[PDB]
């Protein structure tokens with residue numbers, strides 16, 4: 001309802017640059033605020049995209065849903081093309097906290113059913129199970145906009 | 149002072165820039181003192197924590213392509229516990 | 237160009253950065269500012285190779301490609317113990333426990 005694309009109907013050509021070692025999942029927030037997944041981008045690859053002014057995009061790891069940055073921020077909004085020159089959407093790894101990075105590595109090695117078999121504190125078991133999720137992040141970003 | 153000393157459970161002394169150690173909220177509190185002893189963090193974990201501080205300070209607020217922070221599977225569990233205690 | 241290092245001696249490890257164009261002698265001045273030992277009482281190594289004071293860190297093999305923030309390059313250090321230099325000794329870090337069955 002709040003975080004949604006504006007139906008401008010004004011085309012905007014964008015280049016999605018995956019400057020990360022992850023397979024990227026571009027996510028478009030439709031006119032109702034629903035995340036719509038788009039075809040994945042392999043690690044060093046770029047893609048020319050036809051989008052519109054005022055549309056909202058976010059990018060995640062396709063396999064784990066780990067958060068990624070686009071032009072050093074969470075959301076990408078295609079702007080006006082000056083001279084038909086496309087807008088760059090530089091998709092990079094954020095500087096994850098060492099804790100989050102450790103959670104990522106552990107999640108990648110152990111099956112979710114065996115998280116409870118790990119010899120760690122109960123709060124860390126819950127942290128492993130609280131895997132990254134687009135809907136949760138959208139709720140978080142919506143809450144942070146109200147504070148402003 | 150300019151540098152601080154972080155001592156592992158097995159006695160290894162790691163001398164890092166004060167600004168880099170302040171990345172950890174736990175260390176920041178323990179200092180505010182120029183040395184900190186970690187009776188639960190071994191050297192193979194604490195060395196990686198110091199490498200993380202360098203990585204974080206170098207790549208935060210930077211447009212240069214950020215590389216992946218590598219974590220060997222063998223160190224992942226202990227490093228997770230250490231990161232959780234250190235709040236970093 | 238910055239180069240990221242671990243200057244190691246016995247159970248001591250200094251995490252610092254330096255320019256690729258900076259010299260081995262200039263690195264000894266950095267060690268002096270930390271461990272309070274003058275350059276004449278220091279020997280710096282790359283593996284078993286003794287490094288010459290006038291050589292740049294780049295010339296000694298410490299480049300941006302090999303001395304990364306997340307994987308710093310190791311520089312060995314030995315002090316002069318009463319006019320005779322000690323042998324280069326670097327205590328290894330602890331061994332990680334055996335990988336759990338779940339991994």
Ligand SMILES: COCCOCCOc1cc([C@H](C(=O)N2C[C@H](O)C[C@H]2C(=O)N[C@@H](C)c2ccc(-c3scnc3C)cc2)C(C)C)on1
Pocket residue numbers: 007008009010011026028038039040041047049050051052055
């Ligand atoms: C010119 O005025 C039009 C008036 O019509 C009224 C305004 O139209 C429109 C049209 C649209 C949407 C739309 O089209 N969008 C949404 C994003 O903005 C993107 C765009 C879109 O789907 N582009 C296509 C071409 C496309 C883009 C990227 C890829 C990817 S992503 C990774 N690898 C690939 C290959 C694939 C396909 C549709 C509802 C889907 O919203 N409003």
